[model samples]
Target: MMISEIRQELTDHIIPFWNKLRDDENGGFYGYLSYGLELDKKADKGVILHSRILWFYSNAYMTLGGDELLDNAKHAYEFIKNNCIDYEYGGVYWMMDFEGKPADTMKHTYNIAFAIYALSSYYRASGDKEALALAYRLFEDIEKNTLYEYGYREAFDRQWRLVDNEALSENGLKADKTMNAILHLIEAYTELYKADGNEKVADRLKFQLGQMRDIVYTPDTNALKVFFDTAFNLVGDIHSYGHDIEATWLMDRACDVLGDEDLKKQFAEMDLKISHNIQDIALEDGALNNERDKNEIDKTRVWWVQAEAVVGFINAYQHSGDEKFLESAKSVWENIKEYIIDKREGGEWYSEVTFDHTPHDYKETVGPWKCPYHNGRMCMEVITRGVDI
Candidate 1:
């Protein structure tokens, strides 16, 4: 299996599947797809979901070489600027009503980071000055206000004061901060730097590199640690396999795009080390596993996790040209096609599947957390890697 094959699967199957779910009438997406394939047209939308869609379609156009993708990205960008953004406060909002009013005003740095991620890509896709301006505004918001004495705080008030961290945690412990937030912050900042040559953005991006080395990367497990305390101490021992592999390649991009040769060499070595470690622990056969929550492990293969895994593994193959990495990348796409993609009567993707490849149908098809980001990224990555257009 080559990167080419996975690219086609992504473009042919994944992109087309999600594109069908777009809700033109209600604006943004349909917002909810219950287990039974019912589209809740008026369901509330999350800022994360819209931002991801915006990133996906925008990148799809840019990478695949088409203006229609720019058009598609425009739909997502409009919702992001008009609805998801907080006009009063500096950063983006969390969720919105069906009519595009604010639903949940809880301000998390993680959410704002992703908005930066999408908006940067949108800016690049169309040379849109306003998009870059909004992204840079949020970038300043996170750097100046979101950081604590050690790392970035987890949650904040509507006016930027710190609050509870329930917005991002799953396990019993209340996290003071999170790896998911910081990883995406780096990811978002990486795009901002790429879109426009900002020295302030570059300096903050350098700070993130230091944080990745000191706080984010855990060499013993080859996994980036997830949660944190206020003093920058370890929060817990959970392993997000999705984020581990996802960041493996993204961290390098941050370094490479910055064109800092010394930093690139340092980060590249660490990035490949993490990719190799993930290959050893997480990439079993073809399926990527769920997070090792506490000591208990869920072997359920999530739809989006596999999607990111495809890109990460393919990325490893590109970096190392290792046949195993190529083979594993191909195998994950096979697993996705065989069991993950839902072709049952106008169906799309199954939200989750057992480790043994049994599809779970009792999940939402579209929601605040679920959207076109990962699957679309998988396809776009393939197109960039030489898959058929």
Candidate 2:
């Protein structure tokens, strides 16, 4: 019964809202919308923004099923192919101007992985061979240029030379390797392997899965490590509750998609532990909290953190048969509707809200790091999981 409400939110609210941001003239979605409800149509478009939009609508087409959805997906595919892909450097650009010219020519491993993620989904839904080929090419580029003996490095110059990882690192430290980069790498390759059963992609997926289990997950903390050095040493004490919870379900999904029963059992156990850890430490006032840096805990209610919590808690319930997790999932959704949603014309969720439910004064409704991926995936996961209910 509640699943119907969730599906309606996706249709009536989320999909139509995002479709309005599509740039018919400029190509790709508009890159900026302020918290004050301002739309910057001429803002520089982020490749991450385009990739997530492409992934969202493409999956929306497949899940909800409509001609218009496919058209939306195709539109994003065209923009991604024309503007985001770097023809010379062999990866996607970091940023493009409103006219679709490359504004930032840097090649980042995270950026390229997101493009593959979006392109892989577009290929699967549209039967577009070109999209698949593009994803394959990016996959090759990531391996050849970005990979080290340890793992994938973070940022690179346009010609594949090493650069400062200022793009991914935060909280006053430049990390040599980051859990964020590697997690998305697993995410991208998982989707790629699902769309096309390439042995190389599958191999990388397995390697990444192993990395998550071995280096990333801290068994004592029941959370994933945030930042790491070249030797995989912990660089910070920041506990990213969102990523741990997101990884709980995402890693479970990867294992399930990979069709390894032993691996599935292994990861599902860890997923349950991680989900329990989030519930114990991070869940607050019916929504998820932001990360914890040593003694300091940032309690802002980020849109993506709550969105991932809904899916992850539901996933934990499914795996462990704990009704508390299900209750937690539904409660977070209620909080989202009550506080997180913008409820304005042409509005999406706020970038973040305080623990007391005050909107961030400086946040944007749409931007480089903000997009439909998290919330869209939340709605879709609810609808899909309702099959068992």
Instruction: Give TM per candidate.
Output: 0.94, 0.98
Residue pairs that clash (backbone atoms under 3 angstroms), model 2: none
Candidate 2: list runs displaced more than 4 Å.
387-389
Best by TM-score: 2
Native-to-model Cα distance after best TM-score fit, residue 241 in candidate 2, in Å: 0.6
Tens digits of lDDT, candidate 1, 1-389 = 45566556656766776677676876776677786888777888888888998998888888776676787789888888888887787788888887778898888888999999999999999979999989988888888778766767868877888778986887766688787887888888899989988888888778877888888788786678887777667777788888888887788888888998998888877877887887778776578887887778777899888888877877777777677876777777888888888877666778899987777767777788778788877777776776221
Candidate 1 global TM-score: 0.94
Which model scores highest in lDDT?
Answer: 2
Off by over 4 Å in 1: 1-7, 387-389
Candidate 1: lDDT of 283? 70
